[PDB]
Design a protein around this nucleic acid. Structure first.
Ligand SMILES: [Mg+2]
Ligand SMILES: [Zn+2]
Ligand SMILES: [Zn+2]
Ligand SMILES: [Zn+2]
Lengths: 40, 238, 159, 48, 115, 350, 78, 139, 179, 576
DNA sequence: AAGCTTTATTGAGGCTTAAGCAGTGGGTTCAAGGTACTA
DNA sequence: TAGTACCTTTAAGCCTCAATAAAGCTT
RNA sequence: AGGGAACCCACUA
């Protein structure tokens, strides 16, 4: 994952950008689908 | 030096205050050790070593960039051939007390340049002097006895300090203090004949409800440039 | 020294300068009429370097007030324009009003008693600019005066 | 030096020669064509 | 532009006082000798000759600022002795040592010049 | 001072170590800083990013001796976001795009085999055929040279309502203003078509991945304007103004039915103070276009050290804006090896 | 009834010291027994430590109301 | 978040507007704090939490996302003199003149403009002379 | 070629006769992209594992990649590269003798050093920058020491006695004009 | 036009109302002065004889101001104007008639700026509120402003040509509020990160690491000379740590005299082993690497940037929190004076000998570089012969570049650590690194072992030619030499290709500096204008200018950021 | 019936506004040539 | 007739068009 | 006891 940091990310934070450069999620998986890679 | 190692002269000591070697060689210039590690100007140290070798040998050293005929070990062996430490250190003595310095000091001939940035070309102070014709603020630059710009970031820092009165004298009293008279009714700047004490406001046709207002001259200029745009910035002192 | 009471500003009220107010507060009573600034060695009355508008020379005095170049704040002249023209900073506001009022009877296109108008003066009572925005959004889709009032078709103002 | 020598030895003449001759009429014609240039040495003219 | 003249290293201006004693009350039997227009040359010899004195409990000098020409010598003695007396004795011993050094140097010059 | 010995230079109170290379303009020593630019007459294919064009092959074309304003032609491909991907052209003095096969029909070749012979040199790779088919598809309605020329002329700067006026205007645009380095005379439409097909072919290759894209900052793609080209660019405009004022003077003196004095007709101060102004101020143009022109072309020769003088006389300039926040023109490119010092550069906005 | 802090804030200390120093420099009666003192700032500081500055601080609450605290009523930090 | 076997509790985003439209204004305040903290502390540096909290509370004070721009700052209920000191000076003053806006002089930039004592630190109170305490001072 | 270039005045053999010999040639940047360069003729002798046996050109000397102001840096390959950049910036601000006819010139600003010295440690490229003839600086005995704390944070302690003897003394020229 | 007059940073509002040129300001070059206190600025006599403070005439100062008027504007400790009550200014530069030199109570004398005058002293860019602090004027001979060395960290200043601005407060009120709000000792600890902004720096830091080592023994005269520079010293010479055979004091005793009050602090030196605190010698440290200050006495431990620097919980921080700004100001000054005068005995250099390793270390470095280059050739041969399988998430190019960059970074790290192990305790590079004064371990590695890989926009050196980085390599060469891995140290010097690749890498930092200064300043200005009127009110709420509640309590706890500290919750982590 | 017609959402195009701080110094040009007319 | 005074760079927002679609009016 | 403006360029940290 190549998320933006530094001063560009701070500018994208304080200027409320509807199109940030690298939008992303951090999806967390419930229960047994997170224990093993096959159900993930 | 020729290695990006710039720096102002911090103090000048006489020859008897300078540290000295056993043969009485005081350095012309003492630079800080801390200028070297973060900058990694190792060519500066190699030039000092090579210059010691050159001054003792009588040659002019070769410091052409990509040369296998010159490395630090060859320069060191040449230097140790002249009765010096091979790494260019020497035992210096304290100039004040005469005692040997516990560390041995890297000393040697290095080419320094005097830069055109002198302090007598840069020292500037103002107390009160010429002011600009338009905004009546102090002039621009040291060549015309001008003031220094107490800019926006300085204003912001003085806000963060909470120093409201210092901010007020910087941005009002030490730049352009000014007095206007305002009509208490319309808020436009009145007409004030100070010698005959005749204050009036054309448009409201009053002559008694006029108030003196201390505002910066540049603010009066801003308001008169706003009135040229058909804005009425009515300063309501009520 | 001035005899006026020294007191600060608690409020700066903004507004547009009325032409009546410009004519009433001016020191150039006839208006600025001549483009030249000096009639020989004299500054021309009604010219651009009007002597009643401030202090010309560094060592002279003003004519409206008696103060020198330091004490004189400068006083406003005026040009009475032959034909009314647009203030360029106020163009967009003139167009916003023009699509909100009738081109012929100068009535508001929507009612002053309209329930939409009633609750947008409710929700934008202290905010004039947002009130204009809401009235403009109500009047943007219209094309004809409703009425009391006329029923003439209304144009599209294009700048 | 070489770029200026090229300009002052080749390019000025090429600019002068690659220009449309001017024709004037309206009535008789008037044709002006420009031929070789001459650059003198740098001279200064006094007030006399 | 702001260069001090080269003679304020060593010349007392009118009204400047060469040496002042200040009996500091922080510790018993101590003085602060503030010597004007002097440097490490006298401060160091006076300090070391004071350190040879067994009745001197403290002896140190300082230059408060090298851009000023002023020596502060602090001497503390045993209570049966005074810092002023210690300072005078140190200067007398330095003068006698330098006199002996000068005479022996003249003798050695005269011996080597002849052979 | 040309060809003088050291003794002769010292007789004239000149320094024998002085290198020259500057101008004395009103007693000020003025040095012409070399300006870099894209090379002319070379086809560069780039990827315009976040645009309607997927690829763009430009060719800044200059006559190489006459030096008119360099007329760039673009030959672009549209992005996918239509039943195919489509090649268009951006001709000079034609404010709208033209699809490329209409330009090829306007140049004289009407058949599709002739046009694809000018574009695709081997017919045995059909992958390149698949990309030219949409361009042939939207030029289906245009099958004749005058019809294509009308298509060109109906999108020009001022399309005259006469059809033959549009035809003549289009012929003039495609002869004198499209690819003039190929040729501007008559009977040059085959060479212009071959070069335009070469531009299309390069665009197809770059879009096929078969050729890598061109680098803006490759330094073989750049040229440097030294004192010669800069002064010639000035002198073209000032000699044009000299001939303009001669024609104005002589026109005013033949409408009166008289004769003019030609030695008195020449306004000798047009070249003189024009060159003097541009070298003294550094604005590279006319006095009335100071904001339009570029500044810093002529600088006062720095005389603080011999090394600063020598450095100032060998200085180059990328005229890209100093407030530009893109790092790539300021990068030390690989192709600067041995041509440009990797260490010597200013600190700050430049 | 006074809800503001019983301690004197640093801004209050700075402005009370400045105002009192200017008053002393304009020959106001000193409230404390100055002992060879000349600089009005040191006299104002000595008055502040002695809790003798004759100044009331009027602290404005954001709702518009105010609280009048005498300098002698506030706890002196520095 | 709606997917089966996806945690609807911990799943987040770095898109601030997406969190605001999906989850709300307090959620985007916490997310804004987290994102600014990540930017600041990735370098290894540390900023005290109250400064981040004040910035995030300022950005999310009025129920929507107030950008730190002329499109969030100059659209507040602050005075025309405060807005014109930031950006769009002539446009702000035109809009204030046309709508008759009244600047109550309660900010810092407003009083800095007019040379007055800013209600800021030292200037946020008045000092009164105590006549009863003045009776103990000798001339 | 070398023995015949050693006698450029006795022989009238020069660089152009070396170009005309087909021995050196000028290679621009587009042609440089099709050449195979040896850095040194060391690269041309056969190795036990050969990198390239198809060299078409050789560098004359690899230190010709530097310009005028970076050719005065001694040992620039031992320096961190921003420091070479800073010296290229600051060699232009160095005070020396900027030209030999400075007594004739009425320059608005002029800075002449009293006693410029040529460097004791030189590059071979400064024979062509004429830095040996118009040098800008003095060879200073420089100790790298922490002495009394006045050289901290990029400062310099100088010898006052040396400065009294003319060390880095210079003369400033200002010219004024009136019509 | 009028709009152009009112807009922009140069217009009326931003350029003449928010900020403006001011009177009573000075600017010159700054040079160091270790002999000044942290709240003093050394001012040239010409600046002070030109800048005037209007002193109101009282009966207290009738005679002093009369003498100042009598001296006039020519003599420096003199005056420039007399301002009467009616407001006219008697110019004292015309040496006027002696009826004018009369001074009444209520007159203002514009005396020259003298010693002890309060000034605001400022360096641009003014980023935070410690970039603009208050200083006491001290008049010194030459033409520069002179600063203490601990003070250069909040100003972000050095002495390679920096110029700073000096504003003189003109009123007693503003002089008082600069004195009570903005002086340097009050600005020691920042609310931004609840740590000091200013710490012991450079020479004093290197020499306080050298001074507080276990084997530093000072004789009687050396101790007395060092005690001469202790301003807070009570005049009692401490009992020496060793009395026989000869009386010797350690450096820890003299630093215990420097340490103020009864500070209680525990730190660790930079070179503290990770397995020592669990070992048998937890409180009897073999390397003197655990610092314990107990009752204001340095019991044990070598001081460094971790103890005397700008970190949170450090010795200067604990001193501030427990003792106040004045005691901590004296602490800073005493450290600098005593340590700087001991450095005259000890000395500190750096030479070409400190950058040189032994031949065993050179052989180890060359072996590591050779084996890493062979690993890169093996990875290249695997990628050529199709053996290279991609890691999940990446294609063959990011995995090949990742493998090659991992091999080369492991090379640089391993051989840098091999270089650093060779450094003796006499090494001066190591002296400045392990004290935290200047430089890091990557600097030692680059100087001694290997410079490493040059990177342009994150990747290796790009193929700027047709599939070559330079025309000295063959096409499609992906090896370490071809793509910018510098194989030599700065001591050994770089090959011409390595020199060019290193210049390509070093150009990136220059470009990044320029563009980040362009953009970050706009970000900072927008941050200021969005919150400039937000403040803590007297009901302790945090409101903006509209009186809209931003926070009901500041920071949600109601505390200020300066006084808070990193602490540990005891009951959170342990099991039931 | 299934056609006809009207007021609220979308997508692209056009306009506007912004782009670090503080310092030095120099250099140039503004303000310029035809004219229409007299003692 | 000669001569002097006067004539004339890009990046993000907001706003405003053309284009649609349920839904009521009119077969 | 103090009669310039505007722009451009170079530079300083
Ligand atoms: Mg600096
Ligand atoms: Zn009125
Ligand atoms: Zn007036
Ligand atoms: Zn109507």
């Amino acid at each position: 994952k190549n998320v933006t940091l530094g001063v560009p990310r701070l500018k994208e934070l304080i200027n409320i950008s509807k199109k940030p450069k690298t939008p992303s999620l951090t999806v967390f998986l419930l229960g047994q689908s997170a224990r093993d890679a096959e159900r993930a | 030096s020729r290695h990006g190692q710039k720096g102002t002269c911090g103090i000048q000591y006489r020859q008897e205050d300078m540290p000295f070697t056993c043969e009485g060689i005081t350095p012309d210039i003492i630079i800080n050790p801390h200028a070297i590690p973060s900058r990694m100007t190792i060519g500066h140290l190699i030039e000092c070593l090579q210059g010691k070798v050159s001054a003792n040998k009588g040659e002019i050293g070769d410091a052409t960039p990509f040369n296998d005929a010159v490395n630090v070990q060859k320069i060191s062996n040449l230097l140790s051939d002249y009765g010096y430490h091979l790494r260019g250190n020497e035992v210096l003595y304290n100039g004040f007390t005469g005692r040997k310095i516990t560390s041995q000091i890297f000393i040697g001939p290095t080419y320094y340049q005097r830069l055109k940035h002198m302090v007598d070309d840069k020292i500037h102070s103002r107390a009160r002097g010429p002011i600009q014709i338009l905004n009546r603020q102090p002039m621009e630059g040291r060549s015309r006895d001008g003031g220094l710009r107490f800019g926006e970031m300085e204003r912001d820092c003085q806000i963060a300090h909470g120093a409201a009165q210092f901010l007020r004298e910087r941005l009002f009293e030490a730049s352009d203090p000014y007095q206007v008279h305002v009509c208490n009714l319309c808020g436009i700047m009145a007409i004030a004949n100070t010698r005959t004490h005749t204050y009036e406001c054309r448009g409201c046709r009053n002559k008694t409800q006029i108030s003196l207002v201390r505002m910066p001259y540049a603010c009066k200029l801003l308001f008169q440039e706003l009135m040229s745009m058909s804005i009425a910035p009515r300063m309501m002192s009520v | 020294d001035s005899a006026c009471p020294l007191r600060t500003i608690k409020r700066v009220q903004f507004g547009v300068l009325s032409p009546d107010e410009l004519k009433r507060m001016s020191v150039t009573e006839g208006g600025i009429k001549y483009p030249e600034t000096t009639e020989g060695g004299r500054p021309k009355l009604g010219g651009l370097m009007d002597p009643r508008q401030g202090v010309i020379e560094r060592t002279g005095r003003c004519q409206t007030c008696a103060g020198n170049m330091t004490e004189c704040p400068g006083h406003f002249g005026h040009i009475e324009l032959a034909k009314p023209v647009f203030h360029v900073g106020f163009l967009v506001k003139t167009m916003k009003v023009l699509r909100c009022v009738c081109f012929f009877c100068s009535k508001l296109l929507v009612d002053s008693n309209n329930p939409k108008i009633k609750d947008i003066l409710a929700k934008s009572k202290g905010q004039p600019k947002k009130r204009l925005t809401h009235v403009y959004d109500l009047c943007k889709g219209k094309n004809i005066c409703e009425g009391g009032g006329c029923g003439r078709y209304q144009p599209r103002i294009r700048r | 030096l070489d770029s200026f020598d090229e300009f002052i030895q080749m390019s000025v003449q090429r600019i002068v020669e690659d220009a449309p001759p001017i024709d004037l009429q309206a009535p008789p014609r008037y044709l002006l064509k420009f031929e070789q240039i001459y650059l003198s040495k740098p001279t200064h003219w006094e007030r006399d | 532009m702001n260069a001090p003249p080269a003679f304020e290293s060593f010349l007392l201006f009118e009204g400047e006082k060469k040496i002042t004693i200040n009996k500091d009350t922080k510790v018993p039997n101590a003085c602060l000798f503030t010597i004007n227009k002097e440097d490490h040359t006298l401060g160091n010899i006076i300090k070391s000759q004071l350190l040879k004195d067994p009745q001197v409990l403290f002896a140190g000098y300082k230059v408060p600022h090298p851009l000023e020409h002023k020596i502060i010598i602090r001497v503390q003695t045993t209570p049966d002795y005074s810092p002023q007396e210690a300072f005078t004795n140190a200067i007398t011993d330095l003068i006698s040592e330098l006199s002996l050094l000068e005479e022996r140097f003249r003798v050695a010059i005269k011996d080597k010049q002849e052979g | 001072l040309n060809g003088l010995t050291d003794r002769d230079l010292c007789e004239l109170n000149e320094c024998p170590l002085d290198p020259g290379g500057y101008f004395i303009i009103n007693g000020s020593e003025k040095v012409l800083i070399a300006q870099e630019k894209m090379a002319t007459n070379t086809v560069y294919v780039f990827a315009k990013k976040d645009s309607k064009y997927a690829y763009t092959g430009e060719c800044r074309s200059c006559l190489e001796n006459s030096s008119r304003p360099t007329s760039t032609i673009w030959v672009s491909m549209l992005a996918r976001g239509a039943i195919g991907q489509r090649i268009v052209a951006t001709l000079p003095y034609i404010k709208q795009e033209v699809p490329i096969i209409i330009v090829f029909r306007a140049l004289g070749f009407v058949s599709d085999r002739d046009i694809l012979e000018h574009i695709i040199y081997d017919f045995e790779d059909p992958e390149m055929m698949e990309m030219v088919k949409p361009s042939l598809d939207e030029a289906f309605v245009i099958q004749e040279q005058n019809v294509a020329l009308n298509f060109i002329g109906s999108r020009g700067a001022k399309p005259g309502v006469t059809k033959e006026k549009r035809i003549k205007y289009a012929k003039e645009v495609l002869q004198k203003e499209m690819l003039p380095h190929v040729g501007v005379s008559d009977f040059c439409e085959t060479k212009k078509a071959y070069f335009l097909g070469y531009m299309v072919h390069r665009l197809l290759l770059a879009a096929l991945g078969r050729r890598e894209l061109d680098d803006r900052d490759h330094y073989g793609n750049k040229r440097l304007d030294l004192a010669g080209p800069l002064l010639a660019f000035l002198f073209r405009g000032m000699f044009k103004n000299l001939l303009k004022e001669v024609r104005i003077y002589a026109q005013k003196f033949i409408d009166r039915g008289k004769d003019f004095n030609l030695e008195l007709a020449i306004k000798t101060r047009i070249i003189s103070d024009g060159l003097k102004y541009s070298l003294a101020t550094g604005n590279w143009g006319d006095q009335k276009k100071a904001h339009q022109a570029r500044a810093g072309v002529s600088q006062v020769l720095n005389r603080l050290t011999f090394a600063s003088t020598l450095s100032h006389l060998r200085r180059l300039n990328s005229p890209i804006g100093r407030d530009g926040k893109l790092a790539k023109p300021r990068q030390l490119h690989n192709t600067l090896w041995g041509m440009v010092c990797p260490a010597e550069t200013p600190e700050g906005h430049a | 009834k006074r809800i503001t802090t019983p301690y004197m804030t640093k801004y209050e200390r700075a402005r009370v010291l400045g105002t009192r120093a200017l008053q002393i420099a304009m020959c106001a009666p000193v409230m404390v027994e100055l002992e060879g003192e000349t600089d009005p700032l040191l006299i104002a500081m000595k008055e502040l430590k002695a809790r003798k500055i004759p100044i009331i601080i009027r602290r404005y609450l954001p709702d518009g109301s105010y609280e009048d605290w005498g300098v002698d009523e506030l706890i002196i930090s520095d | 978040l709606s997917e089966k076997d996806v945690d609807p509790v911990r799943t987040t985003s770095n898109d601030i507007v997406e969190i605001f439209t999906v989850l709300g204004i307090e959620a985007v305040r916490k997310a804004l704090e987290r994102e600014l903290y990540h930017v600041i502390s990735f370098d290894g540096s540390y900023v005290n939490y109250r400064h981040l909290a004040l910035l995030c509370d300022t950005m999310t004070c009025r129920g929507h996302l107030m950008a730190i721009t002329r499109h969030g700052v100059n659209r507040q209920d602050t005075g025309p003199l405060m807005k014109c000191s930031f950006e769009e000076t002539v446009d702000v003053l035109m809009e204030a003149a046309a709508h008759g806006e009244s600047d109550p002089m309660k900010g810092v930039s407003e009083n800095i403009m007019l040379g007055q004592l800013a209600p800021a630190g030292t200037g946020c109170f008045d000092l009164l002379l105590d006549a009863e305490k003045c009776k103990y001072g000798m001339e | 070629h070398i023995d015949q270039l050693k006698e450029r005045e006795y022989n009238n053999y020069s660089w152009q006769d070396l170009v005309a010999s087909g021995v050196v040639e000028y290679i621009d940047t587009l042609e440089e992209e099709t050449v195979m360069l040896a850095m040194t003729p060391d690269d041309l002798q056969e190795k036990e594992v050969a990198y390239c046996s198809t060299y078409t050109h050789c560098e004359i000397h690899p230190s010709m990649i530097l310009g005028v102001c970076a050719s005065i840096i001694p040992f620039p390959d031992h320096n961190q590269s921003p420091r070479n950049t800073y010296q290229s910036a600051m060699g232009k601000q160095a005070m020396g003798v900027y030209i030999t006819n400075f007594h004739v010139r009425m320059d608005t600003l002029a800075h002449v050093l009293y006693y410029p010295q040529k460097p004791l440690v030189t590059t071979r490229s400064m024979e062509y920058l004429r830095f040996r003839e118009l040098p800008a600086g003095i060879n200073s005995i420089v100790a790298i020491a922490s002495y009394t704390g006045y050289n901290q944070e990029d400062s310099v302690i100088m010898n006052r006695s040396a400065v009294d003897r003319g060390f880095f003394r210079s003369v400033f020229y200002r010219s004024y004009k009136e019509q | 036009s009028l709009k152009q007059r009112l807009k922009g940073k140069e217009g009326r509002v931003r350029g003449n109302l928010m900020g403006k040129r001011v009177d009573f300001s000075a600017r010159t070059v700054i040079t160091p002065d270790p002999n000044l206190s942290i709240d003093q600025v050394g001012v040239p006599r010409s600046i002070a004889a030109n800048m005037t403070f209007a002193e109101i005439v009282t009966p207290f100062n009738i005679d002093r101001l009369q003498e100042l008027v009598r001296r006039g504007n020519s003599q420096y400790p003199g005056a420039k104007y007399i301002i009467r009550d009616n407001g006219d200014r008697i110019d004292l530069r015309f040496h006027p008639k002696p009826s004018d030199l009369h001074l009444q109570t209520g007159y203002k004398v514009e005396r020259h700026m003298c010693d002890g005058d309060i000034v605001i002293f400022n360096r641009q860019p003014t980023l935070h509120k410690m970039s603009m602090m208050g200083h006491r004027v001290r008049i010194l001979p030459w033409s520069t402003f002179r600063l203490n060395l601990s003070v250069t960290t909040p100003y972000n200043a050095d002495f390679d040509g920096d110029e700073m601005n000096l504003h003189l407060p003109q009123s007693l009120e503003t002089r008082a509020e600069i004195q009570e709000l903005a002086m340097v000792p009050r600005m020691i600890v920042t609310p931004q990160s609840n740590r000091p902004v200013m710490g012991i720096v450079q020479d004093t830091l290197t020499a306080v690491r050298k001074f507080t080592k276990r084997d530093v023994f000072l004789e009687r005269g050396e101790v007395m000379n060092l005690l001469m520079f202790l301003s807070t010293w009570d005049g009692k010479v401490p009992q020496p740590a060793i009395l026989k055979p000869r009386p010797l004091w350690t450096g820890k005793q003299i630093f215990s005299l420097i340490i103020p009050g009864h500070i209680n602090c525990i730190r660790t030196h930079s070179t503290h082993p990770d397995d020592e605190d669990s070992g048998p010698y937890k409180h009897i440290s073999p390397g003197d690497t655990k610092v314990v200050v107990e009752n204001g006495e340095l019991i044990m431990g070598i001081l460094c940037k971790k103890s005397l620097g700008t970190s949170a919980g450090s010795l200067v921080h604990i001193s501030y929190l427990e003792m106040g700004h004045d005691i901590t100001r004296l602490f800073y000054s005493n450290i600098q004076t005593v340590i700087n005068n001991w450095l005259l005995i000890e000395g500190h250099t750096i030479g070409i000998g400190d950058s040189i390793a032994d031949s065993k270390t050179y052989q180890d470095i060359q072996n590591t570089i050779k084996k890493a280059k062979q690993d890169v050739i093996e990875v290249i041969e695997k990628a050529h012969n199709n053996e290279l399988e991609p890691t999940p998430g990446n294609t063959l190019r990011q995995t090949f570049e990742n493998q090659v960059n991992r091999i080369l970074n492991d090379a640089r790290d391993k051989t840098g650590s091999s270089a650093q192990k060779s450094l003796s305790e006499y090494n001066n590079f190591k002296s400045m690194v392990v004290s935290g004064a200047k430089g890091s371990k990557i600097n030692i590695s680059q100087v001694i072992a290997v410079v490493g890989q040059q990177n342009v926009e994150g990747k290796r050196i790009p193929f700027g030619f047709k599939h070559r980085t330079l025309p000295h390599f063959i096409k499609d060469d992906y090896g370490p030499e071809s793509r910018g891995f510098v194989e030599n140290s700065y001591l050994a010097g770089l090959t011409p290709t390595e020199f060019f690749f290193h210049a390509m890498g070093g150009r990136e930092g220059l470009i990044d500096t320029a563009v980040k200064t362009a953009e970050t300043g706009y970000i900072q200005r927008r941050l200021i204008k969005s919150m400039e009127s937000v403040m803590v009110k007297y009901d302790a709420t945090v409101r903006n200018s509209i009186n809209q509640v931003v926070q009901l309590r500041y920071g949600e706890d109601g505390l200020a950021g300066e006084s808070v500290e990193f602490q540990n919750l005891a009951t959170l982590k342990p099991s039931n």
